[PDB]
Amino acid sequence: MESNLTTAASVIAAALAVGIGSIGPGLGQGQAAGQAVEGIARQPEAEGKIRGTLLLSLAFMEALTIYGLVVALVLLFANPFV
Amino acid sequence: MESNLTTAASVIAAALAVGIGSIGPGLGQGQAAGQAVEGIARQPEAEGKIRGTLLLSLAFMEALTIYGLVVALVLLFANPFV
Amino acid sequence: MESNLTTAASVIAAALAVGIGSIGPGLGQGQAAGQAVEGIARQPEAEGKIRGTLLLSLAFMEALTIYGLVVALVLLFANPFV
Amino acid sequence: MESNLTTAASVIAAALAVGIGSIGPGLGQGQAAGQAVEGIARQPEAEGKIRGTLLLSLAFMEALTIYGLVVALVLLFANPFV
Amino acid sequence: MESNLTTAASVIAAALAVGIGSIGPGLGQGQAAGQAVEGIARQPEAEGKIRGTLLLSLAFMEALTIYGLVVALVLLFANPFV
Amino acid sequence: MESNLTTAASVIAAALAVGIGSIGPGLGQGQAAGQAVEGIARQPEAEGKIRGTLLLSLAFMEALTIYGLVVALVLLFANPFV
Amino acid sequence: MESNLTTAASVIAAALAVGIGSIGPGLGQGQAAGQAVEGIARQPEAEGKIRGTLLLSLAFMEALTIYGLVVALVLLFANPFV
Amino acid sequence: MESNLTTAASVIAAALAVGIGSIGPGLGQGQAAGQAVEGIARQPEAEGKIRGTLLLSLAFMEALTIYGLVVALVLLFANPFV
Amino acid sequence: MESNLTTAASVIAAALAVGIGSIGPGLGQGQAAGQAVEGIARQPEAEGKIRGTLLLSLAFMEALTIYGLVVALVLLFANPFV
Amino acid sequence: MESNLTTAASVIAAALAVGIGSIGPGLGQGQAAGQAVEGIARQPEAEGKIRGTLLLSLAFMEALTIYGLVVALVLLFANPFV
Amino acid sequence: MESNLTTAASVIAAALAVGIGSIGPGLGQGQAAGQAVEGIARQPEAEGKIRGTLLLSLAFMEALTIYGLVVALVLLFANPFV
Amino acid sequence: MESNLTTAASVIAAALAVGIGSIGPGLGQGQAAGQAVEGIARQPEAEGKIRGTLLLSLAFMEALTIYGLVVALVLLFANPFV
Amino acid sequence: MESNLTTAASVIAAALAVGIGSIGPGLGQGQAAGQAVEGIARQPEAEGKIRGTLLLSLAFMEALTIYGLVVALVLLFANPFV
Amino acid sequence: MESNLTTAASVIAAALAVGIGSIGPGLGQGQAAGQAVEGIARQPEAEGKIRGTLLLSLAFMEALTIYGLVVALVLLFANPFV
Amino acid sequence: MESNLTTAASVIAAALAVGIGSIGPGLGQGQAAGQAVEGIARQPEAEGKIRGTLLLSLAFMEALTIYGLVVALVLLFANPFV
Ligand SMILES: OC[C@H]1O[C@H](O[C@H]2[C@H](O)[C@@H](O)[C@H](OCCCCC3CCCCC3)O[C@@H]2CO)[C@H](O)[C@@H](O)[C@@H]1O
Ligand SMILES: OC[C@H]1O[C@H](O[C@H]2[C@H](O)[C@@H](O)[C@H](OCCCCC3CCCCC3)O[C@@H]2CO)[C@H](O)[C@@H](O)[C@@H]1O
Ligand SMILES: OC[C@H]1O[C@H](O[C@H]2[C@H](O)[C@@H](O)[C@H](OCCCCC3CCCCC3)O[C@@H]2CO)[C@H](O)[C@@H](O)[C@@H]1O
Ligand SMILES: OC[C@H]1O[C@H](O[C@H]2[C@H](O)[C@@H](O)[C@H](OCCCCC3CCCCC3)O[C@@H]2CO)[C@H](O)[C@@H](O)[C@@H]1O
Ligand SMILES: OC[C@H]1O[C@H](O[C@H]2[C@H](O)[C@@H](O)[C@H](OCCCCC3CCCCC3)O[C@@H]2CO)[C@H](O)[C@@H](O)[C@@H]1O
Ligand SMILES: OC[C@H]1O[C@H](O[C@H]2[C@H](O)[C@@H](O)[C@H](OCCCCC3CCCCC3)O[C@@H]2CO)[C@H](O)[C@@H](O)[C@@H]1O
Ligand SMILES: OC[C@H]1O[C@H](O[C@H]2[C@H](O)[C@@H](O)[C@H](OCCCCC3CCCCC3)O[C@@H]2CO)[C@H](O)[C@@H](O)[C@@H]1O
Ligand SMILES: OC[C@H]1O[C@H](O[C@H]2[C@H](O)[C@@H](O)[C@H](OCCCCC3CCCCC3)O[C@@H]2CO)[C@H](O)[C@@H](O)[C@@H]1O
Ligand SMILES: OC[C@H]1O[C@H](O[C@H]2[C@H](O)[C@@H](O)[C@H](OCCCCC3CCCCC3)O[C@@H]2CO)[C@H](O)[C@@H](O)[C@@H]1O
Ligand SMILES: OC[C@H]1O[C@H](O[C@H]2[C@H](O)[C@@H](O)[C@H](OCCCCC3CCCCC3)O[C@@H]2CO)[C@H](O)[C@@H](O)[C@@H]1O
Ligand SMILES: OC[C@H]1O[C@H](O[C@H]2[C@H](O)[C@@H](O)[C@H](OCCCCC3CCCCC3)O[C@@H]2CO)[C@H](O)[C@@H](O)[C@@H]1O
Ligand SMILES: OC[C@H]1O[C@H](O[C@H]2[C@H](O)[C@@H](O)[C@H](OCCCCC3CCCCC3)O[C@@H]2CO)[C@H](O)[C@@H](O)[C@@H]1O
Ligand SMILES: OC[C@H]1O[C@H](O[C@H]2[C@H](O)[C@@H](O)[C@H](OCCCCC3CCCCC3)O[C@@H]2CO)[C@H](O)[C@@H](O)[C@@H]1O
Ligand SMILES: OC[C@H]1O[C@H](O[C@H]2[C@H](O)[C@@H](O)[C@H](OCCCCC3CCCCC3)O[C@@H]2CO)[C@H](O)[C@@H](O)[C@@H]1O
Ligand SMILES: OC[C@H]1O[C@H](O[C@H]2[C@H](O)[C@@H](O)[C@H](OCCCCC3CCCCC3)O[C@@H]2CO)[C@H](O)[C@@H](O)[C@@H]1O
Secondary structure: OOOOHHHHHHHHHHHHHHHHOOHHHHHHHHHHHHHHHHHHHHOHHHHHHHHHHHHHHHHHHHHHHHHHHHHHHHHHHOOOOO | OOOOHHHHHHHHHHHHHHHHOOHHHHHHHHHHHHHHHHHHHHOHHHHHHHHHHHHHHHHHHHHHHHHHHHHHHHHHHOOOOO | OOOOHHHHHHHHHHHHHHHHOOHHHHHHHHHHHHHHHHHHHHOHHHHHHHHHHHHHHHHHHHHHHHHHHHHHHHHHHOOOOO | OOOOHHHHHHHHHHHHHHHHOOHHHHHHHHHHHHHHHHHHHHOHHHHHHHHHHHHHHHHHHHHHHHHHHHHHHHHHHOOOOO | OOOOHHHHHHHHHHHHHHHHOOHHHHHHHHHHHHHHHHHHHHOHHHHHHHHHHHHHHHHHHHHHHHHHHHHHHHHHHOOOOO | OOOOHHHHHHHHHHHHHHHHOOHHHHHHHHHHHHHHHHHHHHOHHHHHHHHHHHHHHHHHHHHHHHHHHHHHHHHHHOOOOO | OOOOHHHHHHHHHHHHHHHHOOHHHHHHHHHHHHHHHHHHHHOHHHHHHHHHHHHHHHHHHHHHHHHHHHHHHHHHHOOOOO | OOOOHHHHHHHHHHHHHHHHOOHHHHHHHHHHHHHHHHHHHHOHHHHHHHHHHHHHHHHHHHHHHHHHHHHHHHHHHOOOOO | OOOOHHHHHHHHHHHHHHHHOOHHHHHHHHHHHHHHHHHHHHOHHHHHHHHHHHHHHHHHHHHHHHHHHHHHHHHHHOOOOO | OOOOHHHHHHHHHHHHHHHHOOHHHHHHHHHHHHHHHHHHHHOHHHHHHHHHHHHHHHHHHHHHHHHHHHHHHHHHHOOOOO | OOOOHHHHHHHHHHHHHHHHOOHHHHHHHHHHHHHHHHHHHHOHHHHHHHHHHHHHHHHHHHHHHHHHHHHHHHHHHOOOOO | OOOOHHHHHHHHHHHHHHHHOOHHHHHHHHHHHHHHHHHHHHOHHHHHHHHHHHHHHHHHHHHHHHHHHHHHHHHHHOOOOO | OOOOHHHHHHHHHHHHHHHHOOHHHHHHHHHHHHHHHHHHHHOHHHHHHHHHHHHHHHHHHHHHHHHHHHHHHHHHHOOOOO | OOOOHHHHHHHHHHHHHHHHOOHHHHHHHHHHHHHHHHHHHHOHHHHHHHHHHHHHHHHHHHHHHHHHHHHHHHHHHOOOOO | OOOOHHHHHHHHHHHHHHHHOOHHHHHHHHHHHHHHHHHHHHOHHHHHHHHHHHHHHHHHHHHHHHHHHHHHHHHHHOOOOO
8 A cells, every 4th residue: 555646646537537527528418419319300210320330420529528437447457666 | 555656647547637638528429319310300211321331330439438448447456666 | 533634634525525526517417417318308208219219328427426426535534544 | 522634525416416416417407407398388288298208307416415415414424333 | 692613614504505595486476476467367267277386396495595594594503512 | 794605695595596497497598488489370269279278388387486485485584593 | 993804705705796686686687578568569559568578577586686686785884893 | 195005905906886887777778769869760659758757767767877976985985994 | 004904905906806707798788799790780770779778788787897997996095094 | 126025916917907807898899799799790771870870889898908908007117105 | 227116106007907808808899700700601691791890899898908108117118207 | 766846847747748638638529429430320331430539539539638648747757857 | 936926916817818818709709610611511612701791790700809919928028117 | 866956846846847748638529529420420421521620620639639749758858957 | 968958848839830730720610621521522513623722711710720830849949049
């Protein structure tokens, strides 16, 4: 067990990476998904096309927060300093 | 028992990870779900397709906050420093 | 019977987790629910399908805040440090 | 009568949990309720179905703030530290 | 009579609980009530139904702020610490 | 005459309770009242119904700020500590 | 003359009570008054009814800021501490 | 001929009362006035009724800022403390 | 030439009163004026009535900032303390 | 030549007065001017009337910021303290 | 070369005057200019009238930021204190 | 191992880079993707064209956050200072 | 070389002048340019007139940020103090 | 391995440049891309022209964040001070 | 080989200039570009005129951020002080 400025900064940093990192992607995924289901209601025959394009987009957005998760996990499990 | 800068930072970090981490996904899930039920009212025959696409979307958004939860749980139950 | 930096941080953390954690889900639940009842007025025959999809959505959003509650309850009743 | 950092933090925490915890749910309940009464005006025959879905939604949103209230009451009446 | 960190924090906390606690519910009640009166103008025969659903909703929202008031009153009249 | 941390905190708290406490209710009352007078212009024969429902709603919103006023008056005229 | 932490806090508190206390009611009165004059243009025969309902509404909103004024005047002319 | 904490606080307080106190009323007066002139263009025969209702509304809103002015003038010309 | 806490506070106060005091009224005047010129374009024959109501409104809003200017000039040219 | 708390505060205050003081009037002038040119396109025969009402309005708004400038210039060229 | 609190405050003040001072006018000019070019597209024969009124308005808005520039230049090239 | 001001700043910086860096791109991707799926519903024959343009756009936006990730990874795995 | 409070203030000031100074003009230029290209699509014969008016507008807005640039360059290359 | 105020400031600076630098461009790219795919759905034959203009615009916006990246890389790999 | 207040301020300043300086231009470029591609879909024959006007606009906006880049590069490569 060690406590210093950098261990303290590391745990806070981990939380900020994943917490702040979910704001834009969370909102964005809701916007895209909302238009997708509205589109399916409008044109059910296009569901396959809509679903595929939504899935691609959700993946691009999810990755943004995953970058934050990666930084958090490095800070907690592969910390370069402490 | 143990109290130091890093234990104090850890408990605050845990709260911020899940607290802030729910803001975007919470708003986004509401946006998507709202469009989904609006679409069902418009085209009830499309309910299956709509429900399926919404569920996928809700899972992508839920995962974002779960990343915050995971950081929180690591900080409380598998803390690397303290 | 105990006051230090980490006990003080823990109580504040518990409050921030549930307090901040209800903001996005609270707003999102209202958005989804509002569209659900608008949908029911528009197409009463679809009420069952709308209600089922809404309930699923409300559960996904409620869970987000419950993650904050879980962190808060760990901090108050199973605190790892103090 | 006792005063320390943790008792002071506890009273502030109790207020923040219930205060901040009412923001999203209060706004969301107004949004849902507003669409409900607009829906009843549009289709008075669907009032029973609208009211039932509204009530379910109001409960989900009210619960979010109740989590904040629970934290506040624990901090004030079952404080684990002070 | 008595002044220390905790009495000072208690009076601030009491004000924050009711002050912040009225923001969401205040805005939400206005939104729901505005839709209610618009609905009554649109369909006066639905006034009884609209009024009843509004009353229910106003009570759910009012309760959110009353949680803030309860905390404030505990802090002022049944303070566990000071 | 006495001046200490708690007398100072009490006067500030009193102002914050009543000041912040008027923000949501003030906005909400304007929203509801605006829709009420728009409704009366649309359907003058519904004025009695609209006025009654508006009055009920204005009372619910006014009470939210009154809770803030009560806390302020307790702090200034029935202060538990100073 | 008298200068201490509490006199300094009192003058600032007085300003915040009326200053912040006018924000919501000011915006809300404008919203309501705007809809009222719009309604009069639409249905001049409804002017009496509209004016009456607006006046009631303006009074409910004005009272909110008056509560802030009362706290301010107490702090300056009937201060309980200083 | 006099400088202390309370003289410094008083001058800042005077400025905050009138400065912050003009924000909501300024915006609300513009909203009401804008709808009034739009109403007059729409229905010039109703100009008298619109103007009378606007003037009443402008007075209610102006008063809100005047409360801030009154606090400021008390602080500068009838200061209870300094 | 004198410098103390109160002279420094006085100059800042003067700037805040006039600076902050122009925000709401500036926005509100633009809103009112914009609707006025749109109204004149719609109904050129109502220009006299529109201009008269606009001028009255502009005066009410200008006065709000003038209260801020009065406070600033008192602080600079008739300071009660320094 | 001379540097003390009050000279430092005076230069900051001067900048704040004109800087902040241009925010509302800048936005408001754009709003009014945009409606003016839209109105001229709609009804070119009303150009003279529109231009005159706009000029009057622009002057009311410009004056708001000029109050900020006047304070800044007093602080720089006729400073009562330093 | 001299460095003191007031030289430091002066350079910051200069930047704030011109930086903050461009926010409202920049936004406002874009709003006015956008409506002007939309108007020209709608009625090309009114271009001369539109351009003239836009130019007048752009000048009024540009002057607001120029006041900030003047304060900045006084602070840097005709500083009353340093 | 090593803790100093710069190791502490490095972990915070890494989190800020990826955290803040995902806000704009997250929101932007959702906006573009939502329009894409709406477009596919409108014109399913354009799906290939829409998908290709969306993919290109998603990549431009994803790269923005990847710049944040690159900085974070340099700070953690190739830190020039510590 | 030279380092003191004023050199440090100068470099920060320079950045704030151009950084903050681009916010309003950047947004405003986009608004104006967007309406311009929309107008060209609507009325291609008006392109010359539209382009000319836009160019004038862009120059007025660009100048606002250039004022910030000038302050920045003075602070770096013609600093009056340091 | 070196730590001082400037190395710490450098790492924070690198993160802020790329983090903050992605906000406007990320949002702007989403807006442009969204209109592009909506346009392709409207007029599939214009896809080539739309895609070309989009790509040009995306490059202009991407460059803005790349300036932030360049600053970050200089601070990390070609630091002029430390 | 050099750390002091001004080197630390310089690196932060460089980051703020380009970081903050991209916010408005980034958003404005997206707005203009979005309208351009919408315009092209609407009127493909006007693509050349639209593209030419857009490119001119994008250059004006890009320049605003380049001013921030110039300040940053002066601070890093031609620093007048350190
Ligand atoms: O008190 C003993 C410790 O002293 C140093 O850390 C000190 C540090 O100097 C001091 O500024 C610090 O107080 C500063 C509080 C800053 C809190 C920080 C803000 C954002 C990042 C997360 C939390 O306390 C540390 C306690 O660890 C060393 O880092 C460490 O080696 C040693 O264990
Ligand atoms: O980090 C290691 C050290 O940390 C504590 O020391 C100090 C620490 O230096 C000091 O900055 C700290 O006060 C710093 C204020 C706490 C602010 C911080 C902000 C982020 C969220 C958590 C709260 O108090 C500790 C108690 O005295 C422990 O008491 C000490 O035993 C331990 O060695
Ligand atoms: O173990 C904690 C110990 O911390 C104390 O040191 C410090 C310690 O930073 C803190 O209590 C106090 O500063 C605490 C200020 C920050 C409060 C914190 C902010 C966010 C998280 C919730 C509340 O000052 C003490 C000065 O003695 C003392 O060492 C001791 O009284 C106490 O037991
Ligand atoms: O750790 C508990 C200790 O806390 C008490 O107050 C200490 C405390 O450390 C310190 O932060 C306090 O200043 C606290 C300033 C911030 C208080 C606020 C409370 C809730 C919101 C977050 C932070 O003043 C005292 C310093 O002498 C006393 O030191 C003592 O009664 C007690 O042992
Ligand atoms: O916490 C209990 C202690 O209360 C006092 O602590 C002192 C403490 O040292 C000092 O930092 C504290 O000033 C700290 C200022 C923080 C005020 C706080 C901020 C947010 C919450 C509301 C107000 O004042 C206390 C009251 O005088 C006395 O020291 C003594 O009665 C007792 O030890
Ligand atoms: O200076 C004498 C007084 O000392 C204490 O109060 C001290 C206190 O410790 C100290 O932190 C305080 O300075 C702290 C300033 C905090 C201002 C506070 C912020 C939010 C709440 C309203 C205002 O000054 C007090 C002056 O009364 C005791 O509270 C009081 O018994 C005693 O009269
Ligand atoms: O509260 C009681 C005491 O208060 C004053 O003492 C101190 C006080 O302790 C100290 O914190 C205070 O500085 C505190 C900074 C003021 C901040 C405060 C924030 C809320 C709005 C009002 C301003 O200065 C006073 C002057 O020295 C009086 O000078 C003293 O005579 C009196 O006994
Ligand atoms: O009666 C006030 C007395 O206050 C002084 O103590 C303190 C006092 O807190 C204040 O002046 C100063 O700190 C003042 C900082 C807060 C300024 C305040 C903030 C909001 C309200 C407007 C301005 O430092 C002094 C240090 O001597 C000295 O005791 C004396 O010079 C003065 O007369
Ligand atoms: O109360 C007046 C006294 O104020 C002067 O400045 C004092 C003052 O107390 C203190 O707050 C000041 O720091 C003031 C920091 C905050 C100043 C700012 C001004 C307007 C906006 C709110 C607060 O520095 C000096 C400390 O030595 C000198 O102490 C003296 O010339 C004079 O007697
Ligand atoms: O107020 C007059 C006094 O001016 C000086 O006060 C000192 C004072 O002690 C110190 O706290 C102060 O630093 C306080 C930093 C606050 C700077 C202020 C913040 C907002 C308004 C613009 C800038 O600096 C003053 C200038 O050196 C000198 O002490 C002396 O010339 C005289 O007594
Ligand atoms: O250190 C020597 C200098 O001491 C004084 O200035 C001191 C001053 O008292 C002190 O509060 C100051 O530290 C206070 C830092 C406040 C920074 C300020 C915040 C907003 C306005 C721009 C920057 O450092 C100054 C250094 O010049 C005198 O102003 C000056 O005559 C003298 O050259
Ligand atoms: O900068 C290198 C220095 O690092 C340490 O500095 C100390 C320094 O004195 C102290 O003010 C510092 O506490 C300052 C608190 C600021 C924390 C910072 C805020 C934003 C960026 C992330 C975290 O802590 C350092 C670490 O203990 C040690 O003094 C020593 O290892 C070395 O001289
Ligand atoms: O202003 C004149 C003096 O300024 C410096 O002194 C001091 C100064 O007093 C002190 O407040 C300063 O620390 C103040 C903190 C810096 C904050 C400031 C905020 C605005 C943007 C720039 C950064 O550090 C300097 C270094 O010790 C120089 O080191 C000194 O040689 C020179 O005489
Ligand atoms: O000027 C470089 C010096 O800086 C180091 O850290 C010093 C430094 O002056 C001080 O501000 C530091 O606290 C720094 C607190 C704020 C740090 C943060 C960093 C980036 C974002 C802006 C500000 O702690 C140390 C105090 O002992 C050490 O003093 C020394 O290793 C080195 O010579
Ligand atoms: O020439 C700068 C000198 O400054 C130091 O004094 C001061 C100096 O204010 C600063 O480094 C440190 O405080 C720096 C705090 C502010 C950091 C600043 C904030 C915005 C701009 C970027 C970063 O503490 C030192 C205490 O020694 C020392 O005199 C010396 O270590 C250093 O060389």
